[PDB]
Paper text:
Here, we report the crystal structure of a full-length GH5_4 enzyme from Bacillus licheniformis (BlCel5B) that exhibits two AMs (Ig-like module and CBM46) appended to the CD. The BlCel5B structure comprises three distinct domains: an N-terminal CD (residues 18 to 330), an Ig-like module (residues 335 to 428) and a family 46 CBM (residues 432 to 533). Full-length BlCel5B is active on both cellulosic and hemicellulosic substrates and auxiliary modules are crucial for its activity. We find that the large-scale conformational adjustments of the distal CBM46 mediated by the Ig-like hinge domain are crucial in active-site assembly for optimal substrate binding and hydrolysis.
BlCel5B crystals in the substrate-free form and complexed with cellopentaose (C5) were obtained and diffracted to 1.7 Å and 1.75 Å resolutions, respectively. The substrate-free and complexed structures exhibited no substantial conformational differences (with the exception of the substrate). Because of minor variations in the loops located distal to the substrate-binding site, a root mean squared deviation (rmsd) of 0.33 Å between the complexed and substrate-free structures was observed. A single protein chain occupies the asymmetric unit, and most of the residues were built, with the exception of the first 17 residues and those in the loop between L398 and P405 due to weak electron density. Similarly to other members of the GH5 family, the CD of BlCel5B has a typical TIM barrel fold with eight inner β-strands and eight outer α helices that are interconnected by loops and three short α helices. Very short linkers, D429-D430-P431 and V331-P332-N333-A334, connect the CBM46 to the Ig-like module and the Ig-like module to the CD, respectively. Both Ig-like module and CBM46 have a β-sandwich fold composed of two β-sheets of four and three antiparallel β-strands interconnected by loops and a short α helix between strands β3 and β4. In contrast, the CBM46 has three tryptophan residues, two of which face the CD substrate binding site, indicating that it may be actively engaged in the carbohydrate binding. The CD binding site of BlCel5B is open and relatively flat and is thus barely able to properly hold the substrate in position for catalysis without assistance from the CBM46. We found that the SAXS envelope can be well represented by considering the superimposition of three different representative molecular conformations of BlCel5B: a closed or CBM46/CD-occluded conformation extracted from the simulations with a relative weight of 26%, a semi-open conformation represented by the crystal structure corresponding to 40%, and an extended conformation based on simulations that is responsible for 34% of the SAXS envelope.
Author numbering: 20 to 399, 404 to 532
Write the structure that this text describes.
Amino acid sequence: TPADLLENMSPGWNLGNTLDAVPTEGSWNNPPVREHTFDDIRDAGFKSVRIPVTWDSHIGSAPEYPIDTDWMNRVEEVTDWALEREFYVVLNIHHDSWLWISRMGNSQQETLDKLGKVWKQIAERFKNKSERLLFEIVNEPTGMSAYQMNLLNREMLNIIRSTGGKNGQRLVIVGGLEDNKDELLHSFEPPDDDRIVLTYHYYSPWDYVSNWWGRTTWGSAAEISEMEEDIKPVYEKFVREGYPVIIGEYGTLGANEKHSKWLYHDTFVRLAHKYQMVPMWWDNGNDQFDRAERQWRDPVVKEIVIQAGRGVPNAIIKPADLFIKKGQSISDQTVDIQLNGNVLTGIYQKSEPLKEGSDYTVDNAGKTVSIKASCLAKLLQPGVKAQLTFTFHKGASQVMDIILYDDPKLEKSEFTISQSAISGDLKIPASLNGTKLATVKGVVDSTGRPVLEEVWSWTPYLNYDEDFYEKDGDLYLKERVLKYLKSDSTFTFELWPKGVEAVVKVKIT
């Protein structure tokens, strides 16, 4: 049942940008995966792992398309490591989707024949593995009609089932075009098979999860309702008619603001759990778990996923970052808690409890905390001076950073660039003094229009990572942005806390 799949697999995590890298494992930002990484993911409490695999460069010539023996052995080695740790494991065909499977539209007979020969080999090799191994037919398929998609699912499923044995009953994961929710609802037709699982990916709102166009925060009543409105119809059409469902990918993709990130993950994973959908977290190796340091970049959001993935609601504090300016008058500070049914059990500085009464008070409802000013003053150069851990009877703890900040200071605020010597990003050395980068906008000085008008006409706000970023306290404008510059322009780096900014002028010769 869908309930069974949820109990057994929720929550999951993706081994992203690894076996799916191009041309081979280790070609991108992760080295080839080490066995102990699976021990670390198990320590975290994930019940399942998705192992995206890109087969492309390891597939031999027509007509038999033999998969390189060393590659097949490697994929089995990693898959076995995961299975030995009692994970439910999803094995797929990944970036092949746009590398060659998208030739389906223009050359179906040849492409479908090739994919069939590939799936037959994968199915044969993994035929005798535990039922904890699931096959996913193809990641985010594109370049074909909805009819072709349905045909592809049917034909590949038939190939897997025809190998017999344990593959006769193995769960197989199928979706619509682009693993898209709307396609699943409207153009997808379930194969006639009672051992399939449906899938879609979820990354909405795209501009929030990616921090595009200044969308730095998430969590309005409208946004929460829209998220449930995206998910509920898949439950109504499919889950309550008995189809298990896996959300093969979800998560933030560069969004950094802490409260919103925590709220987004708690809300989504709780909705997934509510509607009996298995949520599998996307992590490209730089997003969440640091495999080299063997620690999570944001431990709190991980604990939120682990608890919400088990149907345990998490309490959410606001603010998550408490900004106090150097020199400012220190008053009692209010912390609101969205309890989500939980009860606050204490507030700690590491292992040392704060004293209720003198350090802080709580209202009768237990959801509004006042941190007394003398306590704050004791807790406090700019930077993180303290971390307060809010513990709850159930669910993840919330950690609030106490940050002393001051006005950000730029060594240089005006830069000259020529249109013919542009090569690499523009570095803007800064002393951010405890502040954090939120977003950036760029305006052409003479016209008042967006610097990137040629691509995004409606806004001057830029996109995280592809246009701007912060690194080691310095600010950067990407080469992409510089190439669109025609005359003198002004960039406004908006920081946390809100209202703090740094203005940089760029002169064009």
